[PDB]
Amino acid sequence: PEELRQALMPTLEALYRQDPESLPFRQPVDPIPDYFDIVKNPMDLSTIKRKLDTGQYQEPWQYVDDVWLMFNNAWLYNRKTSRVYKFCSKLAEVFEQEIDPVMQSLGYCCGRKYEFSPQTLCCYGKQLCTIPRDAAYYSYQNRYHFCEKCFTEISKDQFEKKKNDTLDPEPFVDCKECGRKMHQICVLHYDIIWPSGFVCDNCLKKTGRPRKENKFSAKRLQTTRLGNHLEDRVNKFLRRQNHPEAGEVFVRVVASSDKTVEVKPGMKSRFVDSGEMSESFPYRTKALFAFEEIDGVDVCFFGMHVQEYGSDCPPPNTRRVYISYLDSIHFFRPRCLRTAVYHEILIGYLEYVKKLGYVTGHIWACPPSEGDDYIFHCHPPDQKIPKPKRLQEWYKKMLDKAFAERIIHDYKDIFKQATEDRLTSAKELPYFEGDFWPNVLEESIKDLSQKLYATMEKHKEVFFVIHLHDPDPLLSCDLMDGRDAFLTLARDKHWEFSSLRRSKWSTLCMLVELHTQ
Amino acid sequence: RSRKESYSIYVYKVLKQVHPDTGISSKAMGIMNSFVNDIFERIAGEASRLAHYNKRSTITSREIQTAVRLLLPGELAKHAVSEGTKAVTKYTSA
Amino acid sequence: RSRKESYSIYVYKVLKQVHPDTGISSKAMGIMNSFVNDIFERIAGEASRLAHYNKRSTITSREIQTAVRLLLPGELAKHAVSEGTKAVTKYTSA
Amino acid sequence: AKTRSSRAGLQFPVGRVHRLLRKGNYSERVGAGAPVYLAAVLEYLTAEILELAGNAARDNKKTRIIPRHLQLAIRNDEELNKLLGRVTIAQGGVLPNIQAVLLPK
Amino acid sequence: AKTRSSRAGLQFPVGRVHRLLRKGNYSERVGAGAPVYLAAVLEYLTAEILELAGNAARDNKKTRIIPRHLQLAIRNDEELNKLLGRVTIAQGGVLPNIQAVLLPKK
Amino acid sequence: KGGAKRHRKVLRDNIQGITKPAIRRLARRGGVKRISGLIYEETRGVLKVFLENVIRDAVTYTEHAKRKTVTAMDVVYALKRQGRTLYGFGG
Amino acid sequence: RKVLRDNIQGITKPAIRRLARRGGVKRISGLIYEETRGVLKVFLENVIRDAVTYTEHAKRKTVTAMDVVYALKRQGRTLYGFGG
Amino acid sequence: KKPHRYRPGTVALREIRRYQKSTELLIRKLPFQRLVREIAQDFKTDLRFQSSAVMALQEACEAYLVGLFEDTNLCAIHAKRVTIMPKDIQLARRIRGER
Amino acid sequence: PHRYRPGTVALREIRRYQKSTELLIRKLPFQRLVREIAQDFKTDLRFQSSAVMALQEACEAYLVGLFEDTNLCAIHAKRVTIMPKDIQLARRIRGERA
DNA sequence: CCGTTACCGCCATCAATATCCACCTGCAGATTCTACCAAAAGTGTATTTGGAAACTGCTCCATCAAAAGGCATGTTCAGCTGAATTCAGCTGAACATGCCTTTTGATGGAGCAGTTTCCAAATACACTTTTGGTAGAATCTGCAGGTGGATATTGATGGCGGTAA
DNA sequence: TTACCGCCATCAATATCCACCTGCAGATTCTACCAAAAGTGTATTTGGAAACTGCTCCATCAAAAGGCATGTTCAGCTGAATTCAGCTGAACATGCCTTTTGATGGAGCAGTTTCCAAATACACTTTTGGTAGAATCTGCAGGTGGATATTGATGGCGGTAACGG
């Protein structure tokens, strides 16, 4: 008890030192008759002090859990605009700033009570329906979720009625030598990589045994010509910038499969049944990702989904590339060169597809919806999603920089493309899988040319058409054959990207999964 | 309840000479009284300094004229000197 | 010739007390004379204003002490008030 | 018979000024014409500021002199502003002045 | 046969300070201890300024106090500089002071 | 919540008592169009300093008059002796 | 007596350069010097007139250093070493 | 649907005009009174204050701050800027000579 | 031919004139200017040598102070060369102009 | 090839807003009138005195001479500093949202002031003694000024190293 | 395979430090003088210490309300990067006029004597400005009704241009 008291007393004193932030929490809350109806375990700083002085703590994780439970109770009962909430937030910041060195002196990598953030709840009822925060839902096996509106619109008694506020605490692993309980995410320990067990960093330093090399790194992934070109261009640009914090960046193509997009029934009846336009279009879809070595750990930070309609594809899709999905994580080092690295990756991809003989590139500049993830699950709360105008300006910078390098010929909005090409029928418009235009054509069908012209004049600023003027083998990856599989596996395994440590853990997990395929 | 000396009713009279139909608020009148007190203190202090410098134990109208010339700006000092000279001449001939 | 009083001998004695082997030039002597005269004038004027403010017609050690506190900053004021208290105590002790 | 202010053609109290000069410890002796001269100067200054404040109030559609009018009168005249450059007028405010660069276009 | 200056144990003239206070027209009356107090304050300030001037002269390998040493002493002491912030010392000069930007920027 | 909402909330240390909109308005009266985020507290400190330039002197007056109440006349004297003479509080 | 004129040019370019060097100025534009001269002239017009006001008040025709000291003290430019 | 929004500076200029055409106090009475009481407590315990003394202190502080702010605005304009930064305040106080 | 880079001799002069206290303005031109200004205000005036010396010393002190303020103002404007706008701003903040 | 549509820039103008003004009207505050009286203020008389005039001793202020060397004056070259231009990260401006702190009014007593007593302490002044200015001559002494050489300071001269075509 | 910008290394031109030594105006040491203060010793007067007490008004506390503190979005403010015309610093030749030492006529500063108009100290009579209470008057602070530039934004048009069939 004396060791724990000596270690943990300075943090509690620092919390007490906060004036007036600590004043409301120095004594147990004495009812506000509804305080006990919300807070089932009312606790305060004096309770910590008496438990620590009495030696009621077997190990410091219980102490920190009590601290964080106190903070949670204060944040729950008090509203956001209340100054008590501000006091609790300041106390939490002070505790976060002070706790880590004390644990590192005690042999622990951290103290903070890490609890998994609420994941995106994709309701299994109406399509694209999500369950927001503090919204009630029905759960089956913690896997099948339905909102109240969809659940009522549909045995029903077996589905558990829950609320979208479940914070899952992170698991723990025991060090085989010292026995200290460590966060699995913080120490990045995975049983598949290290079957011999977990050994903490302090034990490794004290015994002089180096940590075993990771055999499932992004560097060891299968290499491809497009990925190699992207990696080479990114590394050359980083070396030209000569930033000390700019680590090596690895780009690997993980999926490459041939698919076919089918014409929807309305447009098929209007143009395919007469034999004027093909019933299907073949293409090759590719999924690649970018990894950065931060602190000797691979971090996945940027990846795309693309569709490549080759020269064998029937018109108007012949010799085209289309960007279906892309995502990014802001933890790239340095932050200033993150945007430039994304620029170099996109420019290298466009240069490669130009070298392959592709003619036109297509980009849709619509940002993801609020609470929706494209590829990376659980984006950090501080990552501001760009608005459509900001994304359009970013793509304008893309295209200006690309044209400055003579790599592209020109770029336009799709309305300018149609006006200059003098398109007369909807059959001449490119048809891509999951694209916005195929839905608009079916909606208009359910006269067509003028409606398409009006919608195109309305939405030209969102679509970019790029004028430009396969040696990579097919890669069968069921996990990366689309965005649904990865987003489902991350949700089922809590592979969040909301923080640098969680991003590292998720990257390690997906690298192991890809290597084990 | 001791009486507090103030130039109030005098300055108000001066107001009636310059603006018969215009009044003055209590705060503005306090501003005016403070102004006159400050100017009186400055002129008296400069006159005392001039008297001390010349080893003179008496302050006369010449010392006041020198003080107002030193303190007041050009046309203000000229008009103040003219008014003081006129008042002294009127008092002497009275 | 009319005698012109100055603090020359007292400043010289103080310098000998604080620096036995260090001299002082005539120009520096004039600087020190002007310095002590200016401090004298400032303290006397502050004490006079203090006495006028409280309707007091006598300048005692308390007004001088308060004027020194108003004028000298911090440690200078503290040492000056200590020396003044010691001096007045010694003077009244005989 | 006649007050000293009346004999000197002034509204300010000559006797009060003389008494204040006597009690102010400015000099051992005070001349006879010194209080008259000082009262005349004070009366002239008060008349100037009062007429300026009345003009400001008239321009402000007002018939009562307020500290705002006194501040406007004291600030807009260069000599009067110089005389009270180290003086703050309570509840007087400041002159309307916007920097050229801060102006739009 | 004891002088009031020696009675208080001061080097500055108490009688001269009293006479100047009477002559300066500061009040109708002046206390007995006021000149002693003022002389003590003046003597302390003179002692401080002379100590600093002698130190500055010693730093300059000089045994005679010159107005340059007086300026160096007055401007190097924060309290004394604040005391004479609006005072010019003849033939005293200014403290050696060069801004960082004024220094070479190689 | 519970506890108290008056006389027990004690916060906003004296210098922080001056609200951000107060400094903003003071700058607006000074004709300044744009304010840096670091100005406010800095201005507070400057304002802070100003008070020890005045109030202490007024206190030095208050102690001399053997009084325990600070009067407006002592404030006027302190402002005048600092070169900041104020009118209207000489009554 | 001779009516002196155009004596402001006696405040010479190297003199202003030396004054700026004492003031810590490494580089001087060409428009400073004349401007500086004017400022100096203004400063003269600020002080000497007051000294004249002293000299006229003493019924004297010779300007003494004591009047200059008085003018500087009343203008807030107190100077030591020349009396007072 | 595109709510009305004034451009940065228009409302600022309107506030400039409004606060230059008015003379009312800007600092709230209670916090300033508390600050003054604390400052007095730092020098002499158990002091009392007149309402007129507090009003005079507030008026003097507001006037001094207005003068400092206009000086800093001039300083910022001198540096080809329109936003005052603490170095402008430092330079203004240095030229004023307070320190 | 040996030549120093611009600024080196300037800094040398800075150090030399900050280390010494000799008068920088020539005696006779300044005395002539003082006499001209005096006769502009009042004719038939006479001047003590000490009066002229005190006036010149006060002018030198005011000028070195104003030049220091101008140098700080110029440094604030990211410049090392003083321009009349700097001295005008310094005088305006000092209250000598507005 | 010249022609439609996007972009830059102008600008003519529906529309929400703060505000100047046309008008109002109730009230805190300014203005008018009677009365009281201690507080000043004006006049009279004898006394004291600061400074005016009258003459003059005398310090230093103004003026003319001559030399020449310390800088003033003018010229030239380019080092690099101030000034103009672009643009992208980003810090503040404008604003809707929420609440809480400030403002206003009412109420006990901590001390601000008015009265009275009386004594340690302040002037008034006539001597007596000590002492700070200070004319004058004599000896001492810190540093102004010139010499010479060891010591940093500055700048780009020899060459070594990519490197960029 | 030739000039061109960088860097660490030496090296030459040059200002700096500094110890040393000599002539002297200024700093320090006595002799004597001496009138201006300083101090001691009575007489007289009074600023204020001290105690008791009525009257302010200041701290404390209640509710009513006019405000302040946060998070969001983004136009535009700002500072880094780039380029360049030209301004002034460094150097130098020529000579200008300021400084120093000297002397001199005298306008003018200041000491000394005389003495009177002016300031002072009461003593008395006269007016009068400060204060308290009643009651009348009103300038203007907001409150309500248009309503008006005004400026952001929606939009139309003219000029540039940019690439396509």
Author numbering:
A (entry chain K): 1087 to 1117, 1122 to 1244, 1263 to 1554, 1616 to 1638, 1651 to 1698
B (entry chain H), C (entry chain D): 31 to 124
D (entry chain G): 14 to 118
E (entry chain C): 14 to 119
F (entry chain B): 12 to 102
G (entry chain F): 19 to 102
H (entry chain A): 36 to 134
I (entry chain E): 38 to 135
Quote the original article.
Here, we report cryogenic electron microscopy structures in which a p300/CREB-binding protein (CBP) multidomain monomer recognizes histone H4 N-terminal tail (NT) acetylation (ac) in a nucleosome and acetylates non-H4 histone NTs within the same nucleosome. p300/CBP not only recognized H4NTac via the bromodomain pocket responsible for reading, but also interacted with the DNA minor grooves via the outside of that pocket. This directed the catalytic center of p300/CBP to one of the non-H4 histone NTs. Representative writers of lysine acetylation (Kac) are E1A-binding protein p300 (EP300; KAT3B)8 and its homolog, CBP (KAT3A), which can transfer an acetyl group onto the NT lysine residue(s) for all four histones. That is, p300/CBP reads H4NTac at the bromodomain pocket, rotates in multiple directions, and rapidly writes NTac to non-H4 histones within the nucleosome independently of the DNA sequence.
By preparing CBPBRPHZT (residues 1084–1873) protein corresponding to the same construct as p300BRPHZT, we also determined three complex structures in which HAT of CBPBRPH is oriented toward H2BNT (CBPH2B·H4acNuc) or H3NT (CBPH3-I·H4acNuc and CBPH3-II·H4acNuc). The overall conformation of CBPBRPH·H4acNuc complexes was almost identical to that of p300BRPH·H4acNuc, and the H4acNuc-binding modes of bromodomain and HAT were also almost identical to those of the corresponding p300BRPH·H4acNuc structures. HAT of CBPBRPH in CBPH3-II·H4acNuc was located closer to H3NT than in CBPH3-I·H4acNuc. In all the structures obtained (five structures of p300BRPH·H4acNuc and three structures of CBPBRPH·H4acNuc), their bromodomain bound to H4K12ac of H4acNuc at the inside of its pocket and to the minor groove of the nucleosomal double-stranded DNA at the outside of the pocket. The position of bromodomain interacting with the minor groove varied from complex to complex, but in all structures, the third basic patch present around the BC loop (BC basic patch) interacted electrostatically with the phosphate groups of the double-stranded DNA backbone. Collectively, these results suggest that not only p300 but also CBP can acetylate multiple non-H4 histone NTs by rotating themselves on the nucleosome with their bromodomain bound to the acetylated H4NT as the axis.
